[model samples]
Target chain A: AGMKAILQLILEKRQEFEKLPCFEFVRDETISPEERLILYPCIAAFALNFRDLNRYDYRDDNSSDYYQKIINIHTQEDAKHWEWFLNDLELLGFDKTMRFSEALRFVWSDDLLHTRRLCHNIAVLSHDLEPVMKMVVIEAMETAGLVIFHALAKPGESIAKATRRKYLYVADSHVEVETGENIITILEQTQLSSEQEEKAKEIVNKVFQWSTNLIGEFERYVKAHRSEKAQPTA
Target chain B: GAGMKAILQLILEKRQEFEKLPCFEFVRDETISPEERLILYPCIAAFALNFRDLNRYDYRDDNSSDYYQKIINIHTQEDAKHWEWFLNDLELLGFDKTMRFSEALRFVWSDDLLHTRRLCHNIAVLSHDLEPVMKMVVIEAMETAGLVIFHALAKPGESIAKATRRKYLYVADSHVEVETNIITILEQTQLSSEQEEKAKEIVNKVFQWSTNLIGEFERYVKAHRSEKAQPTAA
Candidate 1:
């Protein structure tokens, strides 16, 4: 019964995540190169985080071959995503070092810590819970990211705004797709015991609450930025 | 011109001083603490493997020497044995196999393993024919730093049997002996004085870079340990 409830929640989150707006700003042909360069790093950072979390080592001899096939397919898809962003940056003729590598050192540090904590949670808590928690977190974050991207990509925005939108879209899509796959893979790999089922329920509830908080935070960042822009001249 | 000559003389004097540095004379013996000795074990093993591989080529013949063949035979066997001993020690220290490859280890290893492997391989291939004497100098510098670090960490009064120490000590002693042989062989090979100096500079750079990275790792570990303990009540 608990398993059915959790599965239902996962399905609902997946559907909600898919319904969020895609980045509209990317379609603007007049967007400046500087804005594209600035945005590419954020996108790359998101993809890197997604790739790292989704990575798994499945070494069981009997099952390893099949798992390898699955992983290869996923990895190739990720490679494509990485290539798209990298190509976009290259097309803009941005200094790769300044745009991507420098930004990475700062943004990646925080992302790495978050990744470590999530992995630690999996190792310490029940393994079954990891999939569900990861899935919901990714879904919620991606949904928020999509909204931000859509706003930034809107027509007539400044170069800075357009760049910001690019980052939002990339980060949004990356987390959503990566997290969705991770949950499905985990569910495929493990059989849930009764205790694991209960833990999964708790994790799903917690994830929903976390998603709510994340959405609120996203709204706050947008509101603050908007109000700052609206202030009267001194 | 006078100042340049004086500076040259000073460099020559310092070079002589470096030849007789204290690190060359230090021995890993019974007097060394168990903690220190244990730490030295991996360093010695890595150095020994590197030295043995570096010694295999005879630049004059442009082929493997008899000594190289013998060393390769020993190296293949010893690498496996060294890995086993290291694994056993880790197990004794209560690190499960799963925990050994957990997030921290994976993070560090993923970032560093390729760099270290490339450094070792380049030294082996390039140093053999072109700059054998420089290899000796760089290896000595690296081993000297390793010994210093080991000495600082070694525990007193706890012995881990003669057999264990003997194995590691054999590897350590060979590192010194092989380095000396490399220097002698380099002297016999024909090369311009300028070329020889250039080769040495390259070797020194490699050694410096490798040691600097090791120092960074040590600092990172220390900082992480302190941060981890910060939340605990005294």
Candidate 2:
């Protein structure tokens, strides 16, 4: 029952995540490319620091559990995607106009509150979870990430073609897909007592609720500020 | 003029200083319990987590020369997974234990691991404005220092693997081989006369920080051993 409930919750949350307005905004053809990618810089900032969130705060190397060993591998893989995102930022010529100070300000601005909260909340919420449920947090985040990248893929590829550049962050790669599948298979084999099962479901639901809120905020931010030009430098 | 040559020369000069670190001897001691010997594991884990940030986010500028960025990218990409090895080895040694979130957090940012965390922080601070070649020098000095530690760790790691019949990559002998090609690339790099002096200074700073970090590890191990040796209050 634990395994079944956990997996089912993940499936429902993932499907619901794709239906969010921000995901829809990224796919909206009438929106300007600039507006569509307005969230890119914030996302990039998050992705760059995402490794710290996973490796430093979340991962526990001291546990002798097989679950953690596999998770260690998964988190390491997730950590590397930041580099690719950095590369694609170069390719996209992101933030070429902003001053370093201004860029820093923008990253920590009120508009990005939920995005930052997403990582912080996960850190606070999942800090004490056992390795198996920690996998749930990773999976939930990964699923959210895939939904984001998938929505942006077509828009991103259009820009890539127009600019004659390649973008790693905007495209859906098989590495994580396969990694996700492997984790799911490993998770399915897990047998938890009823008490553990109930706790796992609670965590799963809470994580996606955070994701749902963040994505909704993303939608609001993109819609509200997408047309504004960069503020003039001092 | 070779940045790598100057860095290597510094490493050679400091070999004895690093070699004499008491933590090395602690790990190599067959009499010490593996858990007791690994009292300093969190320090290593903290550094490992921060290292991913140092390479992927802070260094490896796309605006730099293609060769420079490519080398940094390849080396960092390959080496990023090594932290997983450390986590795996930690579990295998039966040194991993569950702790409260706040307790783990406090320990990670505690004074004992202060130097370790600062080593990564200081490198990242330097990385923002440092040139590509100098960045390579910094990374080279780091990898050289790491080899010194992991080589000693492999001694106990080998015996543990033999007894437990499980593989350990982070502390295993074979792990050091991965850096050979990158070492060759760094060795071939030449520095200008101006850059040479700065390179030497960088190497000095890096080594000093690493030396202090190792000293902290030694301090923790010695204190723990003494505490364990004495009887606790009833």
Candidate 3:
């Protein structure tokens, strides 16, 4: 019950996230060659938000022992062998592109409530508020990330297309999807009692249930941002 | 031209003075007082928490080749585990931390800990001088210094259960390895002459504050013990 909740949430939210214009860059249909140009940088900005949220992981919570637990159960690596997928997104021209700047000017701001929640979920993990629920969100994110990467990298996307190799290189380097899938097994194998694990799964259910609420706002922002660009259409 | 090759060189030489501080050398004995252990574990726990605190500085992606964020991630990851082990050690040693310790530990927390905390909170994070090179230099200096102090804390122990001492030594040695990685990361960095000078200046200031900790702690212990000698009724 604890495990399935995260997977279910990912299943729901990924469907919704795909509707955004940015995801259209990888899909079958598009408006113009210029639309792809616009979409790529927006992807960069979107990825940057996640990069910014990654900062939540960097805090000192008087929990040096927590690192051991994190390494023990969360990840087995010495430094948590995280692939910097965000860097590849940056290389797509986040710093150099005006489309990205215009589209994501206020991503840091919370005027949009959905954007606020996207930020909130990561913050919750740092506080160690609901461990199981947080883990669920993470798994859901990793799963969704895999789906997102697939659409972005093309094929024979089996190994990915030649033109898309640079992006796919980073996408494949990510190990989170496998880790996310194996989370239940990881949890059970750890020393956590079944009851504690159940509680974690319960939280996962709750966060996953709540997680889909942000997709609409992200979608809205993308549509509005597409219109904001005068150059591509010009 | 590039670094404080002279001034910083002199500061490294000045460290022999701190190494010779009487109280700094005293704790190296095999047996630590239960009271001292009680106080000491809290100190260790608090410091370990600071390692977790580095999580605040963590991010998976960076535009700068800044090595500081990775150092924090790795350092915080290690510290996260060490804090818990010490907490366990404290429990095994029979310290009930549910109720806080007053007086001596309070003085240590308020007087000793607060100084570092205050300095940290006031740090000019936005300053041109501090970012890029200084952050990396400061962290390496402090972490390497901590490796020195952590080594000094070990002693022959009879009152301390064997398991507790073993964990402490195990955790401490693991930290020694982490610090070496930090130094290697620092050495690998090649800051320009102007930036290296600024970085060295930052290290010089903070390292001095760290050295003062030797005397400050010794004095605080004396005052705390003096206060303890007086009666509550008096």
Candidate 4:
């Protein structure tokens, strides 16, 4: 209805993301321990939200047994994933004493603009959108987020040797698994009709644009940190 | 509902011996490979997170809907941080994000534990029987034998670290606090005669399931031991 309806554009947006300089900038720039620490918790916070949203699929009524069973596997595994993400944040020694949710509070809206953007985007998708649209956004963004994770972890450089092997190992597996799943097959299993699918297209594109914009925002964060460091002491 | 009174005694009868019998012996005998500990520790981490993220939604159609939240809140009290302490120990003990032990982690997250969790969620949420008394029944059956496991794990000059000893001791205290309060909550809540009889039957079924789950833990551990020990043989 507006000037910028954007859901069907996700594949193109993803293609743009692949070609864009954001991953390179992120890889080049995410090396600072401080920057890495800030984003890590933000990532964990996002994962928690992602896991919870996926949880809405369960029902006591008869849906396709396939959808019910698969959704259970998805939600159950998601619970484990987010929990590990929280565990990893603590073990890797960011805010060493806080619980996952406490750490989430710190990361939820603090520090970087992009981090807050990540939080806001997730919130909008979760609450503002319809359930089917939410799933569309989820399916679209979940895979993209894995790309962000795989690109963003920067394990070897920013991570200490102590946690490096552990971090990359998981970062790699997360990427591998998501990359292997056929998005179309996932879509096929859902009960959405083509009309709902058509409806989802615009919202999915909007979410993708919102997500891909994080790279530019992250690049800015990198530049800001560098500038802050270079400034002379008062 | 009459069984609700008798179910009180079931708590005393439920020994941490579920843990004492198998894993305790594995710990005491020192037969677990370092490989096994790594696998088990991730399971522990996953298990701890399940506690942290328990489903607390109350489906009661009445004003007493707060009951589920209150019970969960009381049970989960400052126990919020338990997962981090566990994640911290597991990571320090080398159970970081490698995904090597993911099979065991998945098992821990999805198996009998989750089954028990759903049962409790339903017992509170569903149950054609009186809800409050059924709640008491579920608690009695779900009341755990974990302290024996933790108590055994804390004993050292053996497999655990100084930190593990300290953390397990802290965990031991939490079990005492939560388990004690569960009993107190049971004592405080009274039920109708029919509710009591129905509750007792539920308790009986639940206790058998929980007891059987504990028995399965040994087989589960052994299957995992072989799975991890020889990946290429298959």
Candidate 5:
């Protein structure tokens, strides 16, 4: 009941995320394709850092061996996802337009503050949690990805079709490639103490808020930078 | 099971061959100074850096069967971070010395390590068209070589650790705990006679790569044996 209830709550919370502007942009065909995907770079930026969460922070020898195994399995699946994002960037013509320094400045600038915060906060929150609590944080992160990527699938599909190219990372195909028992099923298999349950609820609540803020930031970033092409660089 | 048994038998034969190599002989010699032996670290380190990309990203197929994806994902995830361990050991041994960026880059790609480059390339070629089971065979063959190398290095690695009073991950042990056991997931999988023959060819190619690579290692060790007459910090 512990993990199941937490998962249920995350699903319920995602209803709010589904209503965000970034999500709307993806589904709203009335928006020009260019404007609709203004947030792609922001997401791409976040994803670059997000790869390290599983690779570095999620689990360690301090956690139970079984828990480490669970986290490692999830991480290996996620490690190369950035390669797909890079592929989609080329398909979207988003890769070559920026200079190296410009890309570095943008990735590190305040423009991506919330996106970086979303990753940093999750890492900090789970930095020292026990296996059970750590799993909860990871679940929240995974669900957060599902919310964003699931929304991106259709638009990604549109782009892929328009360009006659494959979009593996952003499309529904990425979601479908999830094989084996994921963290959710494993979480469902375990029973947690009442204290652990309460803590799980708290971390879930916080992680979701960070995810929400990140999307909100992407919406704001897209709005601010939408007209940059019409004017020369500052 | 028949295919796995056959692969396992071949691995045993290759392991015996590896044990007889001069590089293995040098590492096994108790009278050789630890600092002198540390020179061979770069060959393994070079491969460690390349191995992650080969295993995690390049060796994958998104459209492959779910079970196949899961097994490769698990294996890749566990193996990917071993390079970090290599870095850690390098620092502990005082081998991570300061050098110009150009110098470092030139040295890494220099002719002295051309065989290491070829070994990585050959493995990539070997993995290019193989099915999931055959890919599993390739992974098994690579691990067979890795276990031989790591097992050989553990004693000298411990001596270095004892001298330095620090632990080493890359040189001390096999990074993946159940490296060979992962292929057991295919225990019940059956292949047609044609597929079995193809699977055996993949194994032979991988072993051939290992044979050539270790030959390079032996040659490199033989050539560099007298260069490190003085320790960097020891």
Candidate 6:
């Protein structure tokens, strides 16, 4: 029941994360470069939110310890995605070490505020809400991160380049594994034991729905701003 | 029984008899002027035809819903004016049933039908799985096409005899606005690393579609212009 509750929370969080406006804005060429630079770190903040929530003790060096491993893997990927964006900026002619780092300070500072809010929400869910709701929210946080990565990783140009691409793939693989494993675990643990399965399924549905809705929003944004290519013209 | 009786009574009272309506109500109603109606009718019909197609495109989020609704409302309100305008133009031209005007309307409508259906189908399938990257790409295609069309139609004082180019420009401009909104939503929701490849695919699609349509429209306009000039020479 506790695990089921947690899964439910994960689902809802995934949906909320998917719906964020920043997720849709970064890839828009019509948006100024300055705006993208400002917006990029918010994705990292969202990822960090997921990491903070899955606070399982990692002292036991067991490879099979699933949730902890998942969180750690995701965190590393989030960090790499952040680095990719920074590198991408350098490739695009922005100074990496000095100018980009300075920009990072500002971006991270704002990201910190969002992170706090996320942490607070997680705390509330874990303490006050059903385990189902908590799990759904956590899943949502992870899915939101995935959705953003998917949107940005277009073929020719994305926020990241080669390294960003590698890290994102790693992160995505981790997320998919976690989502699948967690669902299976929840199903096994709560196999018609009570009404928990129904509740858990509802939570999962909501999370996916939220994720889908967010993706839909992102698509609309991209369509709207698809033509402001950087052209050297009068 | 009481509740059912009350419901029936309310329904009966709400039903208005058309014949019993006051003559003053009819008289006071702002009738579409004969002059404007000539141009307005074709415009409304053309827009409605486009809407029928646009409506088919699945806008799956609040952002899309809001954007589409705004478009639907504006176009619907303007439909009456479009009808009146067409009627007025016909009257001014002293034509009872001109085949040329109808032919032009049919041409535009036919093109719009094809475009809208193709676009809607693409969006529906792409957005179905809530794949942020793919959605972004699809939007990019639509937006780019929209911009190209807008650019082609926004020529200054490029009116050929009988073809009111501004009407085309207005419709294209509206399209651009809607597409732009879609792009904005895409940017916000696509935050993860995995979606990059798909995003690129969608963007490429946008570029391809936009360029193709622009080329087609330009060719059509040029050919039409030349034909008009040839007639004048003769």
* TM-score between predicted and true chain B, model 1: 0.44
Model 3 regions more than 4 Å off? A1-234, B1-11, B29-39, B58-76, B100-109, B116-129, B156-166, B169-171, B185-189, B223-234
DockQ of 5: 0.02
**Error in Å for residue B49 of model 1:** 32
DockQ of each model vs. true complex: 0.02, 0.01, 0.01, 0.02, 0.02, 0.01
Q: Per-residue alpha-carbon lDDT of model 4 for B1-234, expressed as tens digits?
A: 344456566555655335546555764554655335333444444245444433222222334556653564455455444655665454444434333222333334355344432333333323333454465455445544445555554443123443334343222344455444454455666667776666667655655554554445455566667433111111
What is model 4's DockQ versus the real complex?
A: 0.02
Tell me the number of clashing residue pairs for each predicted model: 4, 1, 26, 11, 0, 92
lDDT on C-alpha atoms for all candidate structures: 0.37, 0.66, 0.43, 0.47, 0.67, 0.37
Off by over 4 Å in 4: A1-234, B10-21, B28-39, B55-72, B97-133, B156-182, B185-189, B201-234
lDDT of 3 by residue, A1-234 (tens): 544544554566667656655455445443432233333333332343353344334233444553334423443321232223333333333323232112222332233444433433444433443444344445555555565555444311322232343443234444343444234335433343566556555544544443444444545554656654213110
**Residue-level lDDT for A43 in candidate 3:** 38
**Selected candidate, larger lDDT, 3 vs 6:** 3
Q: After superposition, how far is residue A152 of candidate 3 from its true place, in Å?
A: 50
Which is superior by DockQ, 5 or 6? 5
Q: After superposing candidate 2 on the true structure, give the runs of residues whose Cα lies further than 4 Å from its correct spot.
A: A1-234, B1-5, B31-35, B62-65, B226-234
Per-residue error at B232 for model 4, in Å?
A: 31
* Model 3 / residue A113 / CA error / Å: 20
Q: Return the TM-score for each candidate structure.
A: 0.33, 0.49, 0.40, 0.42, 0.48, 0.29
Full ranking by TM-score: 2, 5, 4, 3, 1, 6
- State the lDDT of candidate 5 residue by residue for A1-234, as single tens digits: 776788788888777777887888778877655566667767655675566566656646455467767777677777667667766665665554432223433554466667854765676667558766777787777777777888787777777776666778778888776433555445577888888888888898898888888888888887887774211011
Cα error, residue A138 of model 6, in Å, equals 3.2
**For model 5, which pairs clash?**
none
Per-residue lDDT of candidate 5, residues B63-155 (tens digit): 666678667867778776676687667667655655432233334444566567446545765666667777777787788788887887777
